[PDB]
Amino acid sequence: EFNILLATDSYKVTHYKQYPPNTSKVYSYFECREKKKYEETVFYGLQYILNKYLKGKVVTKEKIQEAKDVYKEHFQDDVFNEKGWNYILEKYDGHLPIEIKAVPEGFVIPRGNVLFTVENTDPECYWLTNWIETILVQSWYPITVATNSREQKKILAKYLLETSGNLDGLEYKLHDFGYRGVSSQETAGIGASAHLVNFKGTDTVAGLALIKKYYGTKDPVPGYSVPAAEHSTITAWGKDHEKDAFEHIVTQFSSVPVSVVSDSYDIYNACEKIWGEDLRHLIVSRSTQAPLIIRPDSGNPLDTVLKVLEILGKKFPVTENSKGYKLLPPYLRVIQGDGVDINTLQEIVEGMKQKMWSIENIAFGSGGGLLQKLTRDLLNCSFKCSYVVTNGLGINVFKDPVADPNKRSKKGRLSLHRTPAGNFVTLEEGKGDLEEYGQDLLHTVFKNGKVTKSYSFDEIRKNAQLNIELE
Amino acid sequence: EFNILLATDSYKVTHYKQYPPNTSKVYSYFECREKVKYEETVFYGLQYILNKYLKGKVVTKEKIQEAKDVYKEHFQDDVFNEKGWNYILEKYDGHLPIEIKAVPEGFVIPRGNVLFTVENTDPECYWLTNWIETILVQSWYPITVATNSREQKKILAKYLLETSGNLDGLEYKLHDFGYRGVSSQETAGIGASAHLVNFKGTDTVAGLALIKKYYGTKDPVPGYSVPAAEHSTITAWGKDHEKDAFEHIVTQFSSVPVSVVSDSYDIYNACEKIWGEDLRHLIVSRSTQAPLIIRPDSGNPLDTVLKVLEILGKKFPVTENSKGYKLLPPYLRVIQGDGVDINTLQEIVEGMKQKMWSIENIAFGSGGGLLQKLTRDLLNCSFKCSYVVTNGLGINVFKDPVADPNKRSKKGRLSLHRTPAGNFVTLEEGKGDLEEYGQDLLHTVFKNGKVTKSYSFDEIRKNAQLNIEL
Numbered sequence: 053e054f055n056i057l058l059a060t061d062s063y064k065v066t067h068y069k070q071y072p073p074n075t076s077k078v079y080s081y082f083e084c085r086e087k088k089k090y091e092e093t094v095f096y097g098l099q100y101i102l103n104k105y106l107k108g109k110v111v112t113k114e115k116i117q118e119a120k121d122v123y124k125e126h127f128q129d130d131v132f133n134e135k136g137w138n139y140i141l142e143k144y145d146g147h148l149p150i151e152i153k154a155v156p157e158g159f160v161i162p163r164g165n166v167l168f169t170v171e172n173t174d175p176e177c178y179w180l181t182n183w184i185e186t187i188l189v190q191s192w193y194p195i196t197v198a199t200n201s202r203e204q205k206k207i208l209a210k211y212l213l214e215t216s217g218n219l220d221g222l223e224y225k226l227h228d229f230g231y232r233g234v235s236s237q238e239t240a241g242i243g244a245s246a247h248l249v250n251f252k253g254t255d256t257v258a259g260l261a262l263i264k265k266y267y268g269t270k271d272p273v274p275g276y277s278v279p280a281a282e283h284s285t286i287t288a289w290g291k292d293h294e295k296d297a298f299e300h301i302v303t304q305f306s307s308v309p310v311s312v313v314s315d316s317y318d319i320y321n322a323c324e325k326i327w328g329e330d331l332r333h334l335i336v337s338r339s340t341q342a343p344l345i346i347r348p349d350s351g352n353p354l355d356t357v358l359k360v361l362e363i364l365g366k367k368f369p370v371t372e373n374s375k376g377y378k379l380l381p382p383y384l385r386v387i388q389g390d391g392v393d394i395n396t397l398q399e400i401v402e403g404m405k406q407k408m409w410s411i412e413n414i415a416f417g418s419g420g421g422l423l424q425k426l427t428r429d430l431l432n433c434s435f436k437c438s439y440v441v442t443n444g445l446g447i448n449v450f451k452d453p454v455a456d457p458n459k460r461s462k463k464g465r466l467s468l469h470r471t472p473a474g475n476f477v478t479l480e481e482g483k484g485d486l487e488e489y490g491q492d493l494l495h496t497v498f499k500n501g502k503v504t505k506s507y508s509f510d511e512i513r514k515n516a517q518l519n520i521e522l523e
Numbered sequence: 524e525f526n527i528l529l530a531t532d533s534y535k536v537t538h539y540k541q542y543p544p545n546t547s548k549v550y551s552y553f554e555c556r557e558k559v560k561y562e563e564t565v566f567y568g569l570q571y572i573l574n575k576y577l578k579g580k581v582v583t584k585e586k587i588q589e590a591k592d593v594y595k596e597h598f599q600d601d602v603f604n605e606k607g608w609n610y611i612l613e614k615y616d617g618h619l620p621i622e623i624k625a626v627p628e629g630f631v632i633p634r635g636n637v638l639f640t641v642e643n644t645d646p647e648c649y650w651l652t653n654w655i656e657t658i659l660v661q662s663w664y665p666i667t668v669a670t671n672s673r674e675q676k677k678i679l680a681k682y683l684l685e686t687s688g689n690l691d692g693l694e695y696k697l698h699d700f701g702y703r704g705v706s707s708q709e710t711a712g713i714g715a716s717a718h719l720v721n722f723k724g725t726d727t728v729a730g731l732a733l734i735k736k737y738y739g740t741k742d743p744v745p746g747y748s749v750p751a752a753e754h755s756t757i758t759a760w761g762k763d764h765e766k767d768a769f770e771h772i773v774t775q776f777s778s779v780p781v782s783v784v785s786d787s788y789d790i791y792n793a794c795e796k797i798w799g800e801d802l803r804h805l806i807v808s809r810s811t812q813a814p815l816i817i818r819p820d821s822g823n824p825l826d827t828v829l830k831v832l833e834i835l836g837k838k839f840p841v842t843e844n845s846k847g848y849k850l851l852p853p854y855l856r857v858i859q860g861d862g863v864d865i866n867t868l869q870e871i872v873e874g875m876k877q878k879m880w881s882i883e884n885i886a887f888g889s890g891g892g893l894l895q896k897l898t899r900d901l902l903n904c905s906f907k908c909s910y911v912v913t914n915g916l917g918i919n920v921f922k923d924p925v926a927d928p929n930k931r932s933k934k935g936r937l938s939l940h941r942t943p944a945g946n947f948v949t950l951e952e953g954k955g956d957l958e959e960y961g962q963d964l965l966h967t968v969f970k971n972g973k974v975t976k977s978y979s980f981d982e983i984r985k986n987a988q989l990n991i992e993l
């Protein structure tokens with residue numbers, strides 16, 4: 053079972069002794085700090101953390117004792133604040149006297165803005181605010197996955213629109229392949245749910261249960277997949293029987309979309325000689341609702357996509373669309389699912405456009421590049437204290453290192469507002485109380501053990517929409 | 524609750540219809556594929572996965588029904604192998620008819636060797652072997668962290684030994700700061716546990732409980748920490764009261780080691796004026812078992828460290844050790860806990876050596892660099908089918924993409940052996956049975972729902988030791 057008393061950075065155990073005496077309030081905020089591109093971030097993931105780790109009775113007699121025992125050995129000393137945790141147990145039945153205010157989930161906010169704030173609601177628990185910093189800062193992950201996934205949707209939108217005149221099938225152009233490429237089962241579910249804010253194609257099943265449990269959708273499931281082969285299901289037939297493998301598989305899944313990895317021995321021979329000659333008759337007969345999706349899985353991503361397309365282009369009736377780009381027959385498509393990140397995704401669709409191929413032909417699968425190859429410093433996610441009350445007086449606090457202006461933090465009580473031009477502004481020093489900037493966009497989502505405002509996964513998807521999808 | 528029927532990549536759900544008819548055996552293996560850095564990998568993490576996810580009754584009527592309903596919507600079709608999973612439930616009480624053989628945890632193994640193998644023990648369950656690829660492949664992570672952590676230890680060991688003549692305090696030179704910088708709670712523990720194979724300093728509490736539950740140590744805890752400050756505990760005193768903050772903190776922890784971040788406003792001012800003049804009397808009076816550890820947290824990592832050392836070197840009695848390198852008084856140390864990855868760690872210790880500062884002076888804290896900035900392709904961790912039986916006939920299978928020789932997989936039944944020079948070799952095509960290379964070094968660690976071999980965290984630590992340590 054999970055223990056909130058053991059879910060923090062070790063040194064935070066010793067912090068209650070280091071704040072100024074007579075400190076009754078510690079007020080902290082979280083932001084994706086601006087750097088001197090990712091100019092806007094999707095806010096997603098907090099509601100999961102709140103429901104799974106912060107709400108309800110999170111303190112017990114056994115959990116306090118368990119932590120006391122651990123820290124005594126961990127520190128070789130009794131620095132653990134048993135008193136403070138026992139106070140919460142007895143006064144509030146184990147509920148955290150904490151208030152958290154957050155921008156609605158799905159919201160797209162420019163860098164350098166307050167996304168959420170945290171503060172204690174009982175003066176005895178001044179220390180509790182930054183106790184849970186560590187657990188709250190982990191929200192950087194689903195935020196970063198949702199943001200990076202969405203930036204990739206922008207690229208796909210731009211090229212699909214230019215080469216086809218519309219955005220049909222956009223939400224199925226970037227599929228989640230990274231279940232095996234993430235660090236854990238929990239990360240897999242969280243990361244998969246963040247990708248599904250923007251797209252509908254996933255193979256990371258874990259994300260489905262997370263969304264159903266913490267967010268919910270009107271639809272039965274938020275994400276989908278279709279039958280496909282792996283190297284083991286092709287190679288098991290032995291080297292000389294790749295054709296038999298292919299034939300058995302496309303026949304097994306004759307009436308649904310099927311993807312078949314074709315690079316086990318020679319991708320270019322498979323497309324030209326097996327798919328384009330030997331088994332061609334099994335391809336041109338397929339429904340538009342059940343195409344064959346050819347999957348290369350090695351070589352330079354751009355070059356392999358181009359060459360495969362040129363091969364299929366010569367073995368199949370290729371048409372040209374209204375925009376002037378080449379289009380494969382409806383029963384035949386390609387998915388590039390190896391070495392795809394936001395950088396290579398751009399290189400590929402750009403290269404395809406150069407060679408007059410429509411982005412309608414291609415879908416992408418992304419594993420590590422989607423769910424693992426991200427860090428907290430990509431969006432500069434940071435949780436800092438901006439305001440404290442000591443001796444009844446509230447002072448605005450902040451850091452401002454001489455050698456790095458970028459690491460400077462915000463002063464005092466904060467609020468997020470719409471500017472007159474429809475953009476976003478974060479007001480500092482409690483200036484939001486002057487009410488010259490309309491209503492705070494930060495809503496109370498957590499207070500005293502209770503989740504006070506929730507959003508469904510449908511609302512989040514609506515909020516995270518692209519402008520081009522709106523227009 | 525965890526459901527293994529939902530713990531795989533979607534397309535693997537459709538795979539039982541794709542193998543050649545009358546397949547009775549699927550046999551697969553895991554290696555850190557070959558490619559001048561990361562030539563050897565620490566095998567760590569499988570035992571966690573085995574216990575938490577694979578052992579015992581992992582199949583129930585309820586998990587089967589739940590999986591059935593999810594996949595019907597997820598595929599918009601009925602493709603889920605309800606029959607196969609029901610067979611496992613009824614024939615083995617939910618225990619996986621699987622055998623897994625693996626190298627001992629902690630073992631350091633050169634790239635391109637079989638680390639573990641998996642095969643089904645029941646013909647009916649040919650499809651099971653690669654169902655669990657996804658969960659087993661996630662062992663890449665603890666493997667990679669343990670490896671990258673150990674490679675950094677080799678770097679620290681070289682420079683500590685060179686500048687101080689010994690390896691005292693090596694296992695406390697790289698501290699785990701990665702709790703907030705990882706993707707989840709589970710990942711935090713796994714990653715922190717992996718780091719603790721090589722070092723003893725961690726701030727990721729979650730790693731301790733995991734080790735105790737899945738590995739176990741003779742000692743009460745496998746990792747340690749000391750009190751320290753954060754920007755919030757300094758800045759809360761207000762800009763004009765940084766001196767007061769520092770003084771309160773060092774006095775609160777006057778008999779234990781304490782680290783204080785000094786870069787909130789002006790790192791070089793705090794080292795020269797506050798620590799070096801105003802509060803100097805509270806530092807020189809501290810015990811060797813309770814030093815102040817100054818912590819910069821901004822600027823160029825190498826440049827900041829050098830300037831800080833030169834500032835402290837001029838305000839404090841500096842000595843010269845037996846190797847001729849400068850050394851702070853024993854009550855005063857430094858920790859660099861910002862911007863530390865394996866690359867910058869090397870840049871800092873080497874730059875320090877060039878300025879004649881001992882590595883005794885410094886410790887490193889690493890967050891994202893240690894536990895997050897890693898991927899599966901760093902060691903090329905891969906799981907592939909090498910052997911199948913169809914119609915009673917054994918076939919040595921493999922992939923070999925024309926456009927990438929590096930992705931070529933191994934053929935047939937595998938085994939791991941010592942060479943006559945005492946190095947590792949992986950034998951293919953069942954050639955291990957010829958007995959020309961001695962006995963297979965892999966051990967059956969999992970068979971039919973039961974863990975059959977496991978290793979204490981103490982034995983893993985022993986196995987992962989550096990050569991210079993031995």
Ligand SMILES: O=C(NCc1ccc(S(=O)(=O)c2cccc(C(F)(F)F)c2)cc1)c1cnc2c(cnn2[C@@H]2O[C@H](COP(=O)(O)O)[C@@H](O)[C@H]2O)c1
Pocket residue numbers: 224225227228229230231232233252253254255276277278279280281309310311345349386387389390391392415416417418419420421532534899
């Ligand atoms: O084909 C796969 N899954 C089925 C599949 C089939 C077709 C599509 S699609 O063409 O987008 C499509 C079409 C129609 C409808 C849908 C819809 F969605 F509507 F149903 C989706 C999408 C998924 C597949 C294929 N390969 C996969 C994985 C997961 N891991 N890997 C492998 O592991 C690596 C992980 O990547 P990395 O970490 O190295 O970067 C990848 O490269 C692969 O080798 C999944």
Ligand SMILES: O=C(NCc1ccc(S(=O)(=O)c2cccc(C(F)(F)F)c2)cc1)c1cnc2c(cnn2[C@@H]2O[C@H](COP(=O)(O)O)[C@@H](O)[C@H]2O)c1
Pocket residue numbers: 061063429695696698699700701702703704723724725726747748749750751752780781782816820857858860861862863886887888889890891892893
């Ligand atoms: O000071 C901290 N912890 C206490 C602490 C103090 C001193 C040491 S030590 O000097 O190694 C030492 C000395 C004696 C005994 C031990 C022993 F071990 F025996 F007890 C350890 C070891 C730990 C500390 C300080 N900062 C921390 C964290 C966790 N996260 N962060 C922040 O996270 C970022 C990580 O960077 P990034 O890579 O994610 O970008 C940093 O910038 C920090 O702001 C912990």
